[PDB]
């Protein structure tokens, strides 16, 4: 089919090991979050659970195609075939993607080379609580993510205009807590491997 | 041989088949007929606001590419070929760590009718959210949802 030949042409000669613009400029990843539910806050283990739809948008010049079709609205099959950012959550004690019935991932490629990659995630993130004012205590629990291997010179993250979306906030599993609000931050963190762009969401 | 004809039929069916594209792409909307047989309604976890349910989850759909003509109208085939064809990416919106049973083999079945009608069943244990009113507890009653749909494909 037309889409079949388009996909074969795009994958022909493609090297998923190399990020786009390997020696030109950093790859810019626009990140977006939808929070289905912030699970219970486990004060014993200094952690809380959060379920999200996590979306990342970037540009790959190799995936440009010229056709009457303006977008290839694909499924999880080519996620392992194209280059994907190695985004990881820094403060996660335990995290897992969703695999029932199929891997909960979505891939869309536009004719100009824009790739949108979304996936469902459930993350247990550590939140160091200061319980001096317990039970009249308030906390600002973070959720930080960055690129594991690519420093700031290779990958840079940006928050979209609609960065973090929430649904029915007060219908979540926060039995002992009330959600007041959230905010978004970006920072550069120095490590032995290099300097990395860490993006944080505080609840 | 009796089985070589079916081997050739399967090879010709999968030859040139692209499982990255849904049936009827650019021609129509892929209609999936679904039914759920609950083999056991699992216990309700009040602490987790959650309940377990064991289901045979059946989905059926048309695929013109998989039409064939042969000695039998229906090919009851091994589930391993289901990975080699397009199947809907159904997921549970309110699910929480469901498990696809794989003892001894993957508990799935795939059947292809001569007219290209596919039937595809899975065995699952779904753990789903059930928000609760505990103000009338223990005189309380709930309506636990089970919501599912495609992840990648819009209406």
């Amino acid at each position, epitope marked *: 089919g037309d889409v079949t030949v388009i996909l074969n042409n795009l994958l022909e000669g493609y090297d998923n090991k190399l990020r786009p613009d390997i020696g030109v400029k950093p790859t810019l990843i626009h990140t977006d979050m939808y929070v289905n539910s912030i699970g219970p806050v486990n004060a014993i283990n200094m952690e809380y659970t959060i379920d999200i739809f996590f979306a990342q948008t970037w540009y790959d010049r190799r995936l440009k195609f010229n056709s009457t079709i303006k977008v290839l609205r694909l499924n999880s099959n080519m996620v392992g075939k194209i280059w994907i950012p190695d985004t990881f959550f820094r403060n996660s004690k335990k995290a897992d993607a969703h695999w029932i019935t199929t891997p909960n991932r979505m891939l869309r490629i536009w004719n100009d080379g824009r790739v949108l990659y979304t996936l469902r995630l459930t993350i247990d993130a550590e939140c160091q609580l200061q319980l001096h004012n317990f039970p009249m205590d308030e906390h600002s629990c973070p959720l930080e993510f960055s690129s594991y291997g690519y420093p700031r010179e290779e990958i840079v993250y940006q928050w979209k205009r609609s960065s973090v979306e929430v*649904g*029915d*906030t*007060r*219908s979540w599993r926060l039995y002992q807590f009330s959600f007041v609000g959230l905010r978004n931050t970006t920072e550069v963190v120095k490590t032995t491997s290099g300097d990395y762009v860490v993006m944080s969401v505080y609840f | 041989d009796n089985t070589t004809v079916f081997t050739r039929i399967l090879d010709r069916l999968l030859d040139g088949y692209d499982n990255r594209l849904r049936p009827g792409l650019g021609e129509r909307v892929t209609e999936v007929k679904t039914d759920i047989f609950v083999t056991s309604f699992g216990p309700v976890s009040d602490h987790d606001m959650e309940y377990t349910i064991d289901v045979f989850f059946r989905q059926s759909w048309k695929d013109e590419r998989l039409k064939f003509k042969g000695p039998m109208t229906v090919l009851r085939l091994n589930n391993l070929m289901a990975s080699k064809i397009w199947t809907p990416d159904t997921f549970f*919106h*309110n699910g929480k760590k469901s498990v696809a049973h794989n003892m001894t083999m993957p508990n799935k079945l795939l059947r292809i009718t001569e007219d290209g009608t596919l039937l595809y069943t899975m065995r699952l244990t779904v753990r789903a959210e059930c*928000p*609760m*009113h505990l*103000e009338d507890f223990p005189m309380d*009653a*709930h*309506a636990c*949802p089970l*919501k599912f749909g495609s992840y990648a494909y819009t209406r």
Partner: nanobody
Amino acid sequence: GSLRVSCAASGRTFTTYIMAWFRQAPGKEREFLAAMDQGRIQYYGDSVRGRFTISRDYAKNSVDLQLDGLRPEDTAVYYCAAGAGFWGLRTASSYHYWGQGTQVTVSS
């Protein structure tokens, strides 16, 4: 023409309710029109499918109904309901809260 009917609520820690709209034409019969879930899932009646669209502002604790393609047969009094859907989500008996109601009339 086009119209928008809003319905606001307050005075409860209770949230986990479907919020829905019902219609009374002259004749004393309740007709389900639309409903919206806590999962932002929208259910619509067959008669008014694709015409009326329901939405919910959860922070403001309100439900809005945008009405389009109105016709003379749509003249009626519209009621806003909120409640947990037990044995229901399409029957009026499952909603334990109702409003005053608002009239709408179409003149050709």
